[PDB]
Ligand binder design. Structure first.
Ligand SMILES: Nc1ncnc2c1ncn2[C@@H]1O[C@H](CSCC[C@H](N)C(=O)O)[C@@H](O)[C@H]1O
Length: 352
DNA sequence: TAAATTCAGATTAGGAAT
DNA sequence: ATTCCTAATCTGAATTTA
């Protein structure tokens, strides 16, 4: 059984001890192509064992993004990239809550000892929650400090819903612009393109932490001086593309497969607003992307140097009450579609 | 009718005491 | 091997707004 590492630093995170400069990966796992898989770390029993079983028995690298930004984010990363001489994109996001939220020290209570936020999710705290916290602390405004049972209801609910102090006895969740900044995207990366505020929360909560992924993909820069052809599966708002761009790694071609029309609009907007000289090809449903289509694309552009993607965590996340049924769930089973497309690439890149 | 609102527990792990 | 707590957690869907 996979035992999650404590601390969850993977092979090493910046400013922390325990950096592992070399690993030995099995023969069946070697590139080309380099590939990068991502999913949540806190899955039902025996999910990552199955994920590793279908990805050449590579032990997953579990890294909590609280070492890269202000919000925690526990994910597993299966990849065949070299782990030596990584680097972070500069400047790194704000580490603590005091720095990430300058105006919060005006309203933050002394008994809220949080210096770090929990995971950014797709479901945000409601306004009726902020009121129940406001009413709970109201009868103690003239007192220097509310009693203990009043404190830990507020404390536990702030941790439960990732609330920051925005007003007098007012604990509200994060705004989309704050989630963008914490997850490592530029400001207004998901604002336009027909994306409603409701949709912004969902696709942001589903996305990468760009600094964590960029720290991992950083080793690709000396290997490909002339750019890479990228096969992006489950693109979303383009976490991997933003990471590659911040690494100054030219993207000659990005074939993106993302079923959300608003997410594809976000990516195309990001493509033009950055003046990317390369070509962006956009596919929608991965279940209709045939193996011969991949072979035809690889023949035109000359194979993919990197296959990056993160399969749905619908049926793996602890927040899911309805359908947390594991890897065989309706959405998370698309992980085997990732293995299908990846296997086609390997057939041409390495053989057999 | 797109957008916004609201609330709906369980499954893990780990620590610590039997 | 049990019992008992703290603790985190890329969510679904019914319903109402507008
Ligand atoms: N059948 C399907 N075909 C292609 N993409 C799909 C799909 N079903 C779900 N997806 C997409 O897979 C994505 C997984 S969330 C991952 C998003 C990405 N890692 C990022 O950085 O933003 C979701 O955005 C979802 O839109």
């Amino acid at each position: 059984p996979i035992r999650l590492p404590n601390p969850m630093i993977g092979f090493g995170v910046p400013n922390e001890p325990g950096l592992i400069t070399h690993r030995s990966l099995p023969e069946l796992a070697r590139g080309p192509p380099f590939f990068y898989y991502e999913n949540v770390a806190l899955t039902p029993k025996g999910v990552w064992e199955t994920i590793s079983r279908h990805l050449f028995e590579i032990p997953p690298e579990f890294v909590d993004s609280k070492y890269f930004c202000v919000a925690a984010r526990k994910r597993g990363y299966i990849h065949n990239l070299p782990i030596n001489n990584r680097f972070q994109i500069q400047p790194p996001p704000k580490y603590t809550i005091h720095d990430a939220f300058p105006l919060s020290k005006r309203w933050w209570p002394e008994w809220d000892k949080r210096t770090k936020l929990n995971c950014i999710l797709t479901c945000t705290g409601s306004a009726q929650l902020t009121n129940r916290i406001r009413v709970a602390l109201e009868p103690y405004n003239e007192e220097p400090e509310p009693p203990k049972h009043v404190q830990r209801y507020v404390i536990d609910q702030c941790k439960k819903w990732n609330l920051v102090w925005v007003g007098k006895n007012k604990a509200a969740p994060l705004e989309p612009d704050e989630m963008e900044s914490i997850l490592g995207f530029p400001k207004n990366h998901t604002r336009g393109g027909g994306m409603s505020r409701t949709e912004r929360f969902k696709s942001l909560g589903n996305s990468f932490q760009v600094d964590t992924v960029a720290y991992h993909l950083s080793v690709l820069k000396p290997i490909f001086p002339h750019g890479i052809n990228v096969l992006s599966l489950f693109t979303g708002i383009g976490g991997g593309e933003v990471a590659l761009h911040r690494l100054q790694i030219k993207m000659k071609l990005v074939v993106s497969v993302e079923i959300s029309k608003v997410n594809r609009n976000i990516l195309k907007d990001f493509w033009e607003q950055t003046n990317q000289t390369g070509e962006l090809i956009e596919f929608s449903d991965i279940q209709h992307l045939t193996n011969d289509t991949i072979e035809g694309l690889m023949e035109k552009y000359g194979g993919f140097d990197l296959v990056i993607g993160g399969s749905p965590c619908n049926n793996l996340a602890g927040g899911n009450r309805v359908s947390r049924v594991g890897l065989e769930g309706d959405q998370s089973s698309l992980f085997f579609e990732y293995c299908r497309i990846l296997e086609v690439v390997r057939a041409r890149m390495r053989g057999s």
